[PDB]
Copies of this chain bind each other. A is one copy, B any other.
């Protein structure tokens, strides 16, 4: 019974994108067994951000995924001790980000130690010009590679003017504790959304919904 149906979330992100330093605090709440989660974010340093806030949002826990009984839930099995993930975000225009989160737990509260770094965004590109609207929904492919749980995603940012700006995700997920049983090949559907924000995005309210599945023919 280590994970409770209602959990609190504390987060701190430190980052550097195109040479710009920043620090962002996060405070949120979530329902792990329903695969849903919400968070309020506040830029504590480096505001106002000179880049598109949307690039950060997926760095702000796969614990908040609705897993069917017939699929192994690696993420919930990682607790109480916790787990870490490392991610690479490869954008179609040469922009490249890397990110990390060390996730632990105390009582009803998840703690997130997050780092986010980025370079090679063109000065006239959508991220530096803040021409982003939202991430499209996605389907993350979960598989094991040399004993490490890995997720690959084809992601896309919707742009002003109804074009799309493509990004490839790769994430590695590692439990702290030895001998957590790895899952079989499966899928995780995503939908992430900014519900509200102030003008400079110094304050942002974020929401995520995510569900695991086995694909066709078992839709």
Q: How many copies of this chain are found per oligomer?
A: 4
By a CB distance below 8 angstroms, the chain B residues around A158 are 185
> Given A98-B98, A138-B215, A146-B122, do A156 and B185 touch, yes or no (CB 8 Å)?
yes
By a CB distance below 8 angstroms, the chain B residues around A37 are none
By a CB distance below 8 angstroms, the chain B residues around A144 are 163-164
Q: Tell me the complex Cα distance, A103–B217, Å.
A: 26
Of A45-53, A111-119, A194-202, the one contacting chain B is A111-119
Q: Tell me the complex Cα distance, A185–B119, Å.
A: 23
Cβ-defined contact, B154 with A153, below 8 A: yes
By a CB distance below 8 angstroms, the chain B residues around A86 are 18-19, 119-120
A161-202: CB near B (< 8 Å → 1, else 0) gives 001101000101010000000000101011100000000000
Cβ-defined contact, A139 with B209, below 8 A: no
- 21 A-B pairs within 8 Å (CB atoms) are namely A18-B100, A19-B102, A19-B115, A86-B119, A88-B94, A96-B96, A97-B98, A98-B117, A100-B119, A115-B117, A117-B117, A120-B170, A120-B172, A137-B215, A145-B164, A152-B154, A154-B154, A190-B215, A191-B215, A191-B217, A211-B219
Residues of A at under 8 Å CB distance from B? 16, 18-19, 84, 86-88, 94, 96-100, 102, 115, 117-120, 122-124, 136-139, 141, 143-146, 148, 152-154, 156, 158, 163-164, 166, 170, 172, 174, 185, 187, 189-191, 209-211, 214-217, 219
